[PDB]
Amino acid sequence: SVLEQIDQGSILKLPSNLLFENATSDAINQDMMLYIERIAKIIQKLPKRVHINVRGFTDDTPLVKTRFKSHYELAANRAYRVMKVLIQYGVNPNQLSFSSYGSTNPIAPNDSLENRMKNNRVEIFFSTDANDLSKIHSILDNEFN
Template sequence: MPRRDKHTSHDQENHERWLISYSDFMTLLFAFFVVMYSISSVNEGKYKVLSETLIDAFQVEDKEEESSSELIELSDHNKNSMIDFDGRANKEGDVKAEVTGDGDYIGTLLSELSDQVESAFGDLVRDGEITISGSETWIEISLSSGLLFNSGSANLNRQSLPVLEEISSILSGYENPVHVEGFTDDIPIQSGIFPSNWELSAARSAAVVRLLSESGVEPNRLAAVGYGQFQPIASNESAEGRGKNRRVALIVSRDLDVRRALTGVGEAIEASEQNEAEGATPFLKEKDKIKAVELEGGGLLFTQDDQ
């Protein structure tokens, strides 16, 4: 028989076998991103059912209901610490004490102080001789100058003594700083004692500070400030308005770090703009402007005179 030649067959090497692994990898990667997308897209309805099921299973109280009840309780608590801007302590005003940390305690103290003053001087408050206003950081006890002083005088009259002594008794139970501020109307005063309303308002506030100090209020808590006629809260065109502007205000601050904004400035500007819009004469007339005159020997003289 003829001998058959034996040929050894060698399979050719396939260089594209990696495509199979690559396609498997891409398929797995696509599946991975599909799973991730499905996880990120939360079905709120199913999630709510799941959460309610877990709550029922573990008997966990609903946190939202608990938080809501706490908010309601805090809101009711705040209503007990409100101060009315019209001079009445009440439970439905717009001024609230802070509800966290020391703010809650200090706000409560300010509210208590306001209540004590109103309780002690109910008749004077109703007659408008004493007004009480404030915010969460300060309380203003405003006393009519007619209640404390005679016209053009900085000496406390007899009827003022029991009023200020009672206020001193109330303030001595607290540690808050007290700023005493004097105000006048725009009628010029020219006397040997008081060249202008600056001196008169400052002397009146200083007289009140001195009596408070002598009646038991710590002197380091007190300060006296005079604003003259330049912080009106009413129009000086009428006798009633001038009467409101003649006052001494006791500002009880929340703590030593609080600097009270001058609400008198804001009130004056707001009222002035309102009067100007209505065609009324502005509170601060041209004749009220203070001029600085340099003296020959040095220094400055502040005057309202044109000369």
């Protein structure tokens, strides 16, 4: 459950085991509710303008023992589900959204369970829709360019 930063936002990386019973279903676990709740309470502590996008990923594991037809479908539902819980716990739907990246964005080699839980992680990306820099470039455009 590492936290990573990039120039455009903060990323909260959570493996499959911390949210679901397995990496190939949208079915959640026991400790789920308490952990998501913790993250929900934290989110609640951010500016009311910060956007929170819940992105889901999957390994490249063949879909058999499950019901889904794409790793995109699988990712969408898991992300959807985590987005719903965040809400059930108080986060504002207006600030939320969910996503799916399928299987083509791994974190590492799917050689060891641990790493495979990473590739089926949920990612909570935080950010905003800053447009000043763009607001400025535009103004200057019309006047000078």
